[PDB]
Design a binder for this molecule. Structure first.
Ligand SMILES: Nc1ncnc2c1ncn2[C@@H]1O[C@H](COP(=O)(O)OP(=O)(O)OP(=O)(O)O)[C@@H](O)[C@H]1O
Ligand SMILES: Nc1ncnc2c1ncn2[C@@H]1O[C@H](COP(=O)(O)OP(=O)(O)OP(=O)(O)O)[C@@H](O)[C@H]1O
Ligand SMILES: Nc1ncnc2c1ncn2[C@@H]1O[C@H](COP(=O)(O)OP(=O)(O)OP(=O)(O)O)[C@@H](O)[C@H]1O
Ligand SMILES: Nc1ncnc2c1ncn2[C@@H]1O[C@H](COP(=O)(O)OP(=O)(O)OP(=O)(O)O)[C@@H](O)[C@H]1O
Ligand SMILES: [Mg+2]
Ligand SMILES: [Mg+2]
Ligand SMILES: [Mg+2]
Ligand SMILES: [Mg+2]
Lengths: 236, 243, 243, 236
């Protein structure tokens, strides 16, 4: 009872702490509830379109990118009140969809996205969501900060998978190349760029790969821009 | 581990709170990471509507999809800003006296009010009263109550401090329009906006007062929203004394 | 699959609703199964407190544990009853006319009121108006509004029907005590009880009005809780006409 | 737009359906939120006890049976907004804790609970929670409806696991023995018994075992009461 002032009832301290310790969980839990309802509307609209104009490749795209949003809103409502989760996955199962999307988006950008070698049925053990996010972020970094080409190659051996993403955009100067995995950081060249956005991307990448005992590098790219290499280990 | 567990172990007051501060920065990251990752499929969804347009043309349905998407777009952007600020200055509770805590805040409401041709009256000023918490957080919590009262007031704002053995009670009042007794309930919810500020719009995240409630509850105090005698909105913050 | 998807496919009105009815009986089972399985660890927890007692004796802490456990115990029991009823008569929407739907309900409020030495006045009676939904559910939704108004009234109850092209609007009023403008918001929440019925107690699950809101929203209508002119609580139910 | 009356705005039908279809999810989601907060209090009380009276076997029991409650409340808040989930598990991992608890509770009842043969590291694939619930229910049925003894035996072969639970309570007449797996059903003898409770137990058992391609029987028990046999299949 060292927590409120010197004379509060026992019921008073009980409730005082209960508010104190559930406050961020409830904020997230409510932020979660609030994102859900406009998405739910957005989904009813697509339903009502499919009822009228019927099936459509564009529609199906909206229809599923909706579903991705619905899933992640459900992740917030989970891990808010929880405060780690892992399972076994094959690499093709893991990242194929990430790459197919990278393709659809690269085409909309009018940019060439090539996958030199694709992920095989290679054993990983970890968090599916985290690893997808790791790959998607360095790929879409490359999609954006590139001029025209984007290249992605997978490599496997007894020890594990090595993903290599290349672009022909501007490089990242050697000095900046270390600090770009730190949160909210952007190269001086990029905040000057008309591109805007939080420096969170590569920071999410580093913490997902480091939590799977892997590593990430930023390097010179044979394509002229920036090379990003992920390395994860296989599972026994 | 859980700050509740530190409490269960027998750790000091200070340890239990830094444990909480820890769990918070975690939940704070979880928030700003998920926010970051909702933009990805959103961008793709809006690539899709864009292509649906160039094909089947305008639609009552398409228009709904696109505006709920832009709403999601806006909230996520509001959300990233918020936790970027929260994770800018660090979470460090400490002992601090109420007049040190809020004097400079109030002297600015003073000035901001004079710039606006409105009056600010501090009925009773804060005294040298011991609080324990996050000085950036507490500072900011009051500045926002008051900067709001300045905005939504018609002419005058009144800030009032009260101390007793159990703790400090801050009361802020404006002579602007009220808040309907039903919206007085839900103004501390995230993204909530009474339809009136929603009529004027001029932006507005709906997050600020939700931050305040979460922040105060984390200091073991509370907040209420009442009818003000001045006509408009009364906000009350209570916080416990420290020893 | 999801009734939303049936809607997306192009299925009839009737099919979309029986799809919903399906998802409901599922969620209903999920509810009554989880309820059943929370009793297990609760029983064990209360085996534990019982043993803690016989050891270290009474405690402010132990007393808290035991009363929050008995609260959980009570809610789970309230919850099992509820979904047992919901899963007793089946979920079958159908077309039904408003006077067929509610006449017998009202003729009973009449009688129950006369037994209680209170008056019930049906300002405008329900007409032969087409509704589509669950007759057990709709029946029950009104009986509960009215049986409540009988209970919490001081002397008189007033039921009023209104029809127009868009649908039926039922209004129930009692001259009992009100419901504070803040609790008017949260009375449709599960387990909610204004502190006044919580003072008298005499049991009370806090579920009934939550059932009504969920039930009406499922019929595409709505419910509001307003100040009654009669003094007490006004409830309003709107429902759409069918064609 | 066949759903409200003949002249409602498009925004009106959108919201009308959105309420209609999220109504049970939100009821559950809220019923979930409401159970959480008294549990949260109950947990703060135990924390405050461990802070004062310190560690205690009774306390630790309350402390973890709390945690079981917290987990299941989080399951409601999940599967409300979702509308199936399965993974691989070993049988000892699966049901050991269920049995240890059956023991602690049998001791409080002053009844003998014996496990003739225990679950081994035997491969199953399904829902962990569901299968635990299946075993726990027939065991605790036996704990209760018994006079003194309760027996539990596991058996494995190439095809799968066979769990056999025995009690020396009153039997279940052959006729009632089929219908007792139907929901809300109780033998005429049991509603007469001072025992009270919803006839949901065995119904939860049958749907969990049938959803894993298994089966359940109620039979005469060598112990004099009722025998309950579960059979599940192994995993490839
Ligand atoms: N493929 C690339 N080519 C050139 N520069 C890059 C590349 N990837 C990352 N960078 C540099 O690293 C910085 C930070 O990257 P990070 O993904 O962490 O944040 P961001 O991309 O700026 O914003 P967001 O996270 O919202 O996408 C960028 O500002 C950019 O200057
Ligand atoms: N002093 C006030 N008087 C009347 N209404 C208010 C007052 N302050 C806030 N409100 C109402 O409650 C809403 C929620 O306030 P809150 O501070 O939570 O969000 P906001 O001010 O809209 O957004 P932000 O402060 O993040 O830009 C406000 O937009 C306004 O609608
Ligand atoms: N006619 C009324 N007048 C005033 N207050 C009411 C009235 N009806 C309900 N309330 C208040 O709102 C609370 C919630 O009502 P609700 O019907 O949801 O639950 P309940 O009546 O307590 O429980 P149950 O009906 O399941 O036994 C009531 O207990 C009471 O506190
Ligand atoms: N081991 C047993 N011995 C005797 N009768 C049993 C046994 N197990 C089940 N029964 C009979 O089957 C009936 C239904 O069982 P079920 O578990 O489905 O519900 P319940 O045990 O009555 O209630 P609850 O589900 O709340 O525990 C019981 O009423 C009882 O008569
Ligand atoms: Mg990025
Ligand atoms: Mg604000
Ligand atoms: Mg009721
Ligand atoms: Mg049972």
């Amino acid at each position: 009872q060292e927590f409120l002032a010197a004379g509060a009832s026992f019921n008073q301290v009980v409730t005082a702490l209960e508010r104190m310790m559930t406050s961020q969980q409830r904020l997230l839990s409510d932020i979660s509830h609030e994102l859900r309802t406009p998405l739910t509307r957005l989904q009813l609209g697509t339903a009502l379109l499919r009822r009228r104009s019927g099936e459509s490749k564009e529609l199906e795209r909206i229809e599923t990118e909706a579903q991705r949003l619905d899933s992640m809103i459900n992740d917030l409502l989970v891990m808010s009140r929880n405060q780690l989760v892992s399972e076994t996955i094959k690499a093709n199962q893991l990242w194929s969809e990430v790459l197919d999307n990278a393709a659809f988006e690269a085409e909309q950008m009018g940019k060439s996205l090539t996958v030199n070698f694709p992920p095989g049925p290679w054993p990983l053990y970890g968090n599916p969501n985290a690893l997808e996010s790791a790959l998607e972020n360095i790929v879409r970094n490359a999609l954006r900060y590139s001029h025209t080409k984007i290249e992605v190659g997978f490599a496997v051996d007894k020890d594990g998978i090595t993903i290599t993403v290349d672009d022909d955009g501007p490089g990242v100067s050697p000095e900046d190349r270390e600090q770009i995995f730190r949160p909210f950081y952007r190269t001086d060249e990029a905040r000057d760029r008309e591109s805007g956005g939080t420096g969170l991307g590569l920071a999410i990448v580093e913490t997902a790969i480091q939590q799977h005992r892997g590593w990430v590098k930023a390097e010179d790219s044979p394509l002229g821009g920036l090379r990003l290499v992920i390395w994860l280990p296989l599972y026994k």
